[PDB]
């Protein structure tokens with residue numbers, strides 16, 4: 152494997168960007184009847200920090216390529232006007248769904264015109280409540296991943312690919328802690 | 329002819345900014361070589377000033393990772409004994425960064441430096457020099473690469489001079505509303 156801290160690479164940066172262009176085309180098509188425009192009516196991106204920052208940076212650039220103008224707002228995951236505006240929530244990983252359920256219900260109180268969710272990584276086997284994201288870039292099974300914004304104890308977010316961290320790394324680090 | 333109808337000039341393309349960022353990343357790698365940066369045990373702490381810096385921050389931590397500089401990220405709207413690098417998209421009057429740097433010094437980091445994507449040297453209201461600067465721009469109003477006009481245009485991949493038509497038009501529509 153190309154990283155000595157990783158057992159395997161699940162999605163390279165290039166593969167994630169290909170998938171993201173596929174999702175962006177669907178978003179462009181799905182919002183084409185909303186008459187989105189810079190300044191007057193952008194799609195509001197609500198990005199859940201910290202882990203979404205890389206995905207959010209790349210995805211707003213790809214959405215602009217596909218003609219979807221955006222403005223960004225940031226929330227913190229550790230915490231967990233859009234009235235009349237279309238809102239798309241971006242999260243790095245969706246697993247139990249407890250975070251996004253609370254995020255979405257909270258934003259729904261401000262009466263956005265619509266609210267949808269876009270996640271980079273879905274773990275569909277992890278749900279503690281039923282939840283479906285409208286847009287998913289990739290699925291993973293029951294494995295612990297880092298990279299592309301996703302951390303282990305605040306490290307490895309900058310790895311360009313989504314990878315499985317090897318147990319040797321985190322078992323050791325729990326012990327040193 | 330400028331490839332954006334809302335701009336009069338492209339000042340820095342995405343490719344030009346990344347080229348410059350690789351050059352800066354090499355300098356940072358050399359400068360911190362005697363710091364023994366490592367994931368988990370001793371990452372470089374990146375303190376990113378939102379909102380505008382999220383694109384620069386996403387791209388720069390990945391480039392730093394390529395040059396062997398592991399990071400952890402914090403976003404501003406414990407560091408004692410850690411090396412801190414503050415990232416801001418644009419440095420103009422320097423009033424923001426002066427206040428950020430002085431606030432962080434109160435926590436006794438091992439060191440603190442700053443890295444800006446765009447320096448506007450002719451904008452200062454107090455003296456301030458960033459340790460690392462990706463690009464300098466004259467005294468003109470730019471958008472793109474995280475930088476907004478009234479929360480739009482951050483997703484433009486290049487740094488561009490905003491066409492006066494855009495803010496005259498929007499200024500009038502606001503005064504209406």
Ligand SMILES: NCCCN(CCn1cnc2c(=O)[nH]c(N)nc21)CCP(=O)(O)O
Pocket residue numbers: 418419420421422423424425448468469470471475476477
């Ligand atoms: N919107 C907010 C941040 C304002 N910062 C940047 C404001 N600013 C200053 N110059 C520019 C510019 O050219 N384009 C854009 N989009 N913003 C600009 C101030 C930085 P500093 O004066 O404290 O050093």
Ligand SMILES: [Mg+2]
Pocket residue numbers: 168169170172
């Ligand atoms: Mg592709």
Ligand SMILES: [Mg+2]
Pocket residue numbers: 173174177287
């Ligand atoms: Mg799809």
Ligand SMILES: [Mg+2]
Pocket residue numbers: 199200202203228242243244250
């Ligand atoms: Mg999250």
Ligand SMILES: [Mg+2]
Pocket residue numbers: 228
């Ligand atoms: Mg988390």
Ligand SMILES: [Mg+2]
Pocket residue numbers: 377378379380381416417418
């Ligand atoms: Mg900034």
Ligand SMILES: [Mg+2]
Pocket residue numbers: 380475476477
């Ligand atoms: Mg601004």
